[PDB]
Design a protein around this ligand. Structure first.
Ligand SMILES: [Ca+2]
Ligand SMILES: [Ca+2]
Ligand SMILES: [Ca+2]
Ligand SMILES: [Ca+2]
Ligand SMILES: [Ca+2]
Ligand SMILES: [Ca+2]
Ligand SMILES: [Cl-]
Ligand SMILES: [Cl-]
Ligand SMILES: [Cl-]
Ligand SMILES: [Cl-]
Ligand SMILES: [Cl-]
Ligand SMILES: [Cl-]
Ligand SMILES: [Cl-]
Ligand SMILES: [Cl-]
Ligand SMILES: [Cl-]
Ligand SMILES: [Cl-]
Ligand SMILES: [Cl-]
Ligand SMILES: [Cl-]
Ligand SMILES: [Cl-]
Ligand SMILES: [Cl-]
Ligand SMILES: [Cl-]
Ligand SMILES: [Cl-]
Ligand SMILES: [Cl-]
Ligand SMILES: [Cl-]
Ligand SMILES: [Cl-]
Ligand SMILES: [Cl-]
Ligand SMILES: [Cl-]
Ligand SMILES: [Cl-]
Ligand SMILES: [Cl-]
Ligand SMILES: [Cl-]
Lengths: 267, 267, 267, 267, 267, 267
């Protein structure tokens, strides 16, 4: 097989088009149920809140997994992390209701302390095998200059857990209690410098910003004076790539390209 | 010293040519004994099986270190990881005999569970100091989008262990039992997006694919319908860089360039 | 806000200039006290020794944090790591006196064994909150091909600790004993392939090299035959970017750009 | 309350009899389903095989959890640990069939490598909440001179996991996927120096030894020359305490007494 | 020295009386400031609340260190651990006010997750060196059948941290920021089966129970039906040893006897 | 087998005498080479220095393994741990020369930081398989009130490593490089409260104390004012058990009794 192509370019295009059936025209069109994985409360709204509302409005069931409790998110010396975390749980429930999300799994690892370990994979694989989602979204762990370990770890752990949820010898007590192996149909990475699929969110921008500001403990008016300009600059960065005002970007690749693929940066 | 060069380009070329005596013309020409380090059983055959057979045919002694047992490599709910691992040991012995390899060290860490720790360095440094290889091959841990931790950890651990095998205070009980410090002459990274040395394997491609399919538990006919096209697309990617049909690529750099070198990407 | 810009380029420039007040004209001009964080003894002198002497000569108080003890830095089978570490402490005190530095904190993690953990963050945050520095320098952990874990871990741990020193629930027993939260004004990364600020050190090059060779255990005459050419090639690499003979490069970015910023590579 | 007792002895008997309703007369009488936790394949049959057959014969459903795979149990340099683990799975299935057990959960931690961690608690609590056992048996981790860490860790982890299975904030994703908190009715520790309940197994001794010898890989005839004398010495040690030939001993205590109880050694 | 004694009993009494100046007559007589270490909120009041009020009433400054946040202490599926931790902080502040305590350090490790590590030692040694207490109280980690790891770990970590607070190379950045080495004068272990000093608390029993019940989230009336009988049984156990109704027991030993002392059980 | 004994006492004596061939008459009689494991420099001389000189004088080859470097053993704020470790190496070489020992392996883990892990087992098993000792001595990890983790960990790791050195799948790269499995003939635990074999050291006491005081950094004259009385009290404790002035005690048991043996405290 693949003996009749003559150049790498020819082989590459045939591998993507025919063998992997990959395209970027409307990658989320068939989704019935997606899980959006966020490192802290508010990251699904910041990274992809417009698209979450598009998906809920089409009748997609969007479920969050929040990896941490947001304990560390304050500079008030009088507000304990415990009280902050309780506050943030309510803020996310209010944000999520704005976006059409009705279920959140809280892993409750402490903010700034998310482990990178098999144990956290097992928590992700348990929920992926219970919910059988068609799609999983997570941060791109290869974003340049990303300095928060909880973000980098969430991205890697999500990609690894999507792969390992298919393997019956990984976390085998799930299979023994009736949670069968599950194969997700796509991953899409948000918070990405290398998007290849952009969603126009120009008419939902004001809703997205409302869902973000529902996390009031994080976005005081003072902080917002920097964060609205940042958020609009990011959404312009993505929307300009497809000639629209405001976009959200995602990077989608064939499953194969997450491993031993020396030309994965050609998509 | 280096006071008479006038431009960075001049200094750079003099550093590579004169000070480091680096060239890429035939980096493996003097090798008598090499170790090829693979994360799982089948990675030496996939990444570099053609070159392994070229080297064995020239009378190079090629030894494998396999970091993990391949336990997780099945979607059959009836096949335990234990039985899989035993199967894969036999598959690698058959693959390796095809390629001229006569010795495999099995570290036996469980697949998906390779640690990144001093303990695994010590296992690598023990074997490097026992065997005194001239060359070590391993995966490039900086391959973009590589999502398997066992692959990234193998690459980093191999580069670090090659450096630390030279230091008598690293794993000092080896020196005390008679395993002296050893200085390897080259590292070459396979599974790389940035190769700088390509081996033409056009006439050994069918042998390489036979050695890969000897890992029958991994490459069922169904899976092969995707993997032959992938493997030929990869070998075309490398061979086109030197104007041949099928190549294997390696990245080789002076030892110095693995540390504090801001222009290491210029080779 | 940011509703009246029309293109991403416009928004980007406004975000940097107006919102973040970022510029690279003279980033170190207001500094009274800086901490330079080095993985091993001799890295502040190698990475940035010229700039350290410029800063001390202007009356900046430069303090080092050395993360490890340099135990592993010898190929002499008769020199224990313990004796090496004591030697290197004296070498750094002599190097530092040449450069105008009068205080060194030694974390004493063993060389090749620096952890990447909350515990080491807490050591950095304790010293940052005690000393209240205006600036912190550390290695760029994203240097391509950097293969020493102690270097990569130092860079990440320094960036994370600068951020977490502002949070009263991070290492909260410091606040309880009277070490208040501290907000550093800039980070600058040395050992970088992507500098955006270069310091001309042409007239201090011979002093920098003397301060390096004060680490005599590392820079024997044999080793120096490679390291002087390397060091001059690096300083030419940086100086050529601003049209001077010898430079030291730093990468400086707005705090925001270390997190979720998809165009952080545009500066 | 407890104001009218006059002596510690009075209060102690009243606390055990009335408040905690503790007695040792027939502690396993009401059990419908028990889990027996073993460190390695064969420990349930060695520690308590007689009692397991008594309980199965009364229509108790007896389920095993085996913490490890038995990989290390051979002195044959030609038998890999993977092959040994597969052989031992089949030996335990044959042993268990003799004793009336029809379900084994295999946690598959490697022998000599069972972790002491929250992750292994979570595996135990998942199975306890799925199966809702009335009783759990495990090794007494306070056996004097017990030198195998897998045995000590299994006993402590089993005691902790029975307590933490009742707490909805412990392993909270189990509650989210519908595995509710479960409160076990008794724990009984086998392999104990301080039994307080002894089961007469005199007429099932030969069956117990048959069930042990079904683990042929561990009990070769040479090894059996020491192990039959040992096993009969242990069962006499227990049986003599109740005036019977062969006994199996267990230590049972009120749940309160596993915590902050300074007179727990009085039962 | 010690050449003129003839029997072990003679040498032992001379070592305790003369060399170590040990006696149990009034071990807390000279204390001006003590730290009481508790695993969870409420353990100081349960283990030693009477004695705490005696010491505060004599003008001793009593300070708590609480190792964990009490997150796991509920069976209510609607009460998150974050909300429980906030509630328990307020309960301990009310309990502590009843007992005369005016300062609590919260280490905030999560309940059931206290680590056993150098990092937690460092937290203890930082507070011991800041506060310079004369005495430290902690749970006896050798209590038989103690099954809660947070309790065992707190006792061992407290004993080790009191020893290591005197060593300037342990946590050496404390010395560098001006927290000098401190030598505590006594340790006393509560929650002990082997007390050698008992405090009569008969007239403070009702106050002790009030201070316990201030932790309302833990001591609902249902739970109290078992806990008052337990607590009065324990205080009778101690009080009967000195001929009083209700006592709190402590184990005090010379510092030497916590290490390599084969007759430490003779006191 | 063991069907004709009638009582537990009968079976027990037959198991010890006949099956296990255990006796305590002269347990060290046949030894040609022993390894004495110490946590810190000076523990072999303190725990068993008399017996070490008796064995060297009979032509036994006595080898030390020291687990840690003694870094933390000073209260001088001017003496770094690195300098202390170098000083203690020389002190142990002088102590060892007095006692007839000619070989010390230094594992160089930092004092107060010895890990409890498979990695440290592997270091012990490498040396045991290289040297093939007949006997191994180590601290009894069950000494009551022992509060130094390096001591507890050394005892447990030494017992486990002697067992696991016989297993070819444990640390299997040793077998691959030609270090075969080794079966030690006896273990003896020193620093024990439960000795069952006592060596009369009355005429070597002064030499033992000289060998201890050779660790001058630990035994200043001030400290010696407490330590000579302690050491003579301990040696009287042991010697009185066999009717001699000064003794060193050891606990020896059949290998079987370190595992699942409920009457191991009867010897
Ligand atoms: Ca490319
Ligand atoms: Ca470049
Ligand atoms: Ca860019
Ligand atoms: Ca008792
Ligand atoms: Ca005693
Ligand atoms: Ca006994
Ligand atoms: Cl085909
Ligand atoms: Cl085909
Ligand atoms: Cl990370
Ligand atoms: Cl405004
Ligand atoms: Cl020169
Ligand atoms: Cl020259
Ligand atoms: Cl990784
Ligand atoms: Cl086909
Ligand atoms: Cl505004
Ligand atoms: Cl505005
Ligand atoms: Cl790293
Ligand atoms: Cl020269
Ligand atoms: Cl009542
Ligand atoms: Cl009542
Ligand atoms: Cl253990
Ligand atoms: Cl026979
Ligand atoms: Cl005297
Ligand atoms: Cl004297
Ligand atoms: Cl514990
Ligand atoms: Cl009542
Ligand atoms: Cl026989
Ligand atoms: Cl027989
Ligand atoms: Cl320990
Ligand atoms: Cl004197």
């Amino acid at each position: 097989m693949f003996e009749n192509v003559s150049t790498f370019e020819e082989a590459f295009n045939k591998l993507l088009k025919e063998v992997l059936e990959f395209n970027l025209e409307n990658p989320f069109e068939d989704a019935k149920k997606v899980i959006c994985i966020e490192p802290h409360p508010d990251d699904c709204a910041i990274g992809m809140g417009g698209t979450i509302k598009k998906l809920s409005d089409e009748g997609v069931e969007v479920i969050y997994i929040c990896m941490t409790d947001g304990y560390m998110g304050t500079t008030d010396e009088k507000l304990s992390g415990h009280e902050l975390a309780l506050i943030r749980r309510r803020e996310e429930e209010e944000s999520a209701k704005l976006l059409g999300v009705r279920k959140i799994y809280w892993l409750n690892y402490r903010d700034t302390e998310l482990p990178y370990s098999r144990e956290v994979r097992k928590d992700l694989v348990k929920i992926i095998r219970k919910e059988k989602p068609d799609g999983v979204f997570a941060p791109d762990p290869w974003l340049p200059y990303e300095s928060h370990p909880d973000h980098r770890r969430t991205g890697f752990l999500a990609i690894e857990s999507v792969a390992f949820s298919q393997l019956p010898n990984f976390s085998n007590i799930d299979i023994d209690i009736g949670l069968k192996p599950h194969s997700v149909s796509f991953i899409a990475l948000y918070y990405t410098h290398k998007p290849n699929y952009i969603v126009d969110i120009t008419d939902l921008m004001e809703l997205k910003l409302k869902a973000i500001r529902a996390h009031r403990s994080q976005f005081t008016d003072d902080i917002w004076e920097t964060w609205e300009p940042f958020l609009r600059t990011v959404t312009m960065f993505y929307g300009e790539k497809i000639g629209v005002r405001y976009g959200e970007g995602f990077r989608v690749m064939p499953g194969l390209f997450y491993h031993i693929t020396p030309f994965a940066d050609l998509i």
